[PDB]
Amino acid sequence: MGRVADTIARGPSNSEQIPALTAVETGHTSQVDPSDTMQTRHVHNYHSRSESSIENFLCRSACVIYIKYSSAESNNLKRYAEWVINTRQVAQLRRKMEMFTYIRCDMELTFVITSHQEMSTATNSDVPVQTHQIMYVPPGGPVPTSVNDYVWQTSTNPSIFWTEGNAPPRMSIPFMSIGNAYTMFYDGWSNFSRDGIYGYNSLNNMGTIYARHVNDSSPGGLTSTIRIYFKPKHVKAYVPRPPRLCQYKKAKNVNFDVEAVTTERASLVTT
């Protein structure tokens, strides 16, 4: 297992060994212990670095979008979802994955689907329990264009059917990428002319998740909302990066606005 290094005792010294002096004119950072600048005592130290792994750091579920869709078209919600998969909508899950240049992992998608009735003029409203379909179209497939069409037959597309009141539905998505790891920062362009889309959005192409109410519309109608949650598993993350300092602007770019390094102080010397 993993545990912190023990502190080891030393007496006073008065030798020609200098641990304290170093030159940080090299990438080599100092390796000094607190057993090299003062005497210390033997402390058998039982602390574990067990929550600072990259499979405890990244391995908690986090929301990545919500899509709303309606059974009567409440106010520009259509009757089906649609959402081109990326991790860039949020600033939570996104930030932790932009702290590494490359990550390979196996997600678990968990959906949390809830509904609420609309304002409507319908009276004597009783609806049976809703069933929702969540279909995943890998890129280049056919895309639905209406609530009912042939695309929702799910002839080979992965699809989840779920009825309200049951536990949130989840599934695992294996590591699926052209690369040998997902790329979180791409410095290239789509074209060889250095034209078109620039950045990580060039490589992003993970398909689209649609969803709809299976049930034919009731008179009152409802508005459902689906919240997608990704939880990495089996994570190997290569090449670390300084975490973001700036608020994001866009989900396809890194554009940023210039921001302060740190919060103010009164002066150099502050208690």
């Binding site: 990438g27 790329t183 074209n191 060889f192 975490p243 300092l245 700036c246 602007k249 554009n255 940023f256």
Partner: protein, 252 residues
């Protein structure tokens, strides 16, 4: 002593007499692609000593108001030697490097630089609705330079050091392979990068593996009457270059 090094690659050699070690980026020394990590099913040309050898990029003047410089690779070697003539006849390529920044100064000069190789440095843009045009990322052998204060253009790269043109704290560029050229100790920095990418080889023109950045962290300062021009010269030598998937000239 430990202040003296010599590096010989190809028919070039570069020597130093004030030096602090060599930083091997991520502790992997560059070497040819294995047959267990291959993916391209044709013989790779490996020119060897015709492409692995020090090339010298244009020198930049370190002024007392300079805010830094950057060169994207391998777009700064696109015109250099026979390295640049094997990116134009191949769809693929991979190659480590051994960037060597050098910048001598007297013992009455003072100043500090951070020489850092940033894999996959993706630059911002002044307008947040646009992504920067090609000419504003790369200058070829000529460095594009940071500005002290935030700039406003349209397709211009957002250049302010304090964000490093990436929106990350500039002091936190240190997990990336780096050395410091501080003018009271060393006067050279050597960073041996391996090939770092998520695919085994990738098209040289389209994609930029890493971006060198040289950022003054303490301004050049001297008492007047001393030398007023001190240049920073960056040489870089490909290591274990191999290219594959030969096709016609160009990059159209």
């Amino acid at each position: 002593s430990d202040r003296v090094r010599s590096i010989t690659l190809g028919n070039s050699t570069i020597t130093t007499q004030e030096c602090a070690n060599v930083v091997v980026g991520y502790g992997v020394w560059p070497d040819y692609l294995s047959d267990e990590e291959a993916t391209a099913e044709d013989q790779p040309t490996q020119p060897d000593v015709a492409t692995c050898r020090f090339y010298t990029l244009n020198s930049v003047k370190w002024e007392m108001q300079s805010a830094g410089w950057w060169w994207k690779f391998p777009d700064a070697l696109s015109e250099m030697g026979l390295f640049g003539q094997n990116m134009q006849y191949h769809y693929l390529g991979r190659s480590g490097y051994t960037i060597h920044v050098q910048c001598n100064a007297s013992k009455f000069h003072q100043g500090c630089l951070l020489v850092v190789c940033v894999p996959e440095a993706e630059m911002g843009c002044t307008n947040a609705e646009n992504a920067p045009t090609y000419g504003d990322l790369c200058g070829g052998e000529t460095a594009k330079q940071f500005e002290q204060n935030a700039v406003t253009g349209e397709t211009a790269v957002q250049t302010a050091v304090c964000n490093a043109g990436m929106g990350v704290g500039v002091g936190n560029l240190t997990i990336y392979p780096h050395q410091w050229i501080n003018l009271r100790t060393n006067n050279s920095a050597t960073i041996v990068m391996p090939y770092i990418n998520s695919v085994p080889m990738d098209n040289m023109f389209r994609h930029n593996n890493f971006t060198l950045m040289i950022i003054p962290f303490a301004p050049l300062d001297y008492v007047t009457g001393a030398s007023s021009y001190i240049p920073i010269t960056v040489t870089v030598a490909p290591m274990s270059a191999e290219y594959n998937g030969l096709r016609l000239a160009g990059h159209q």
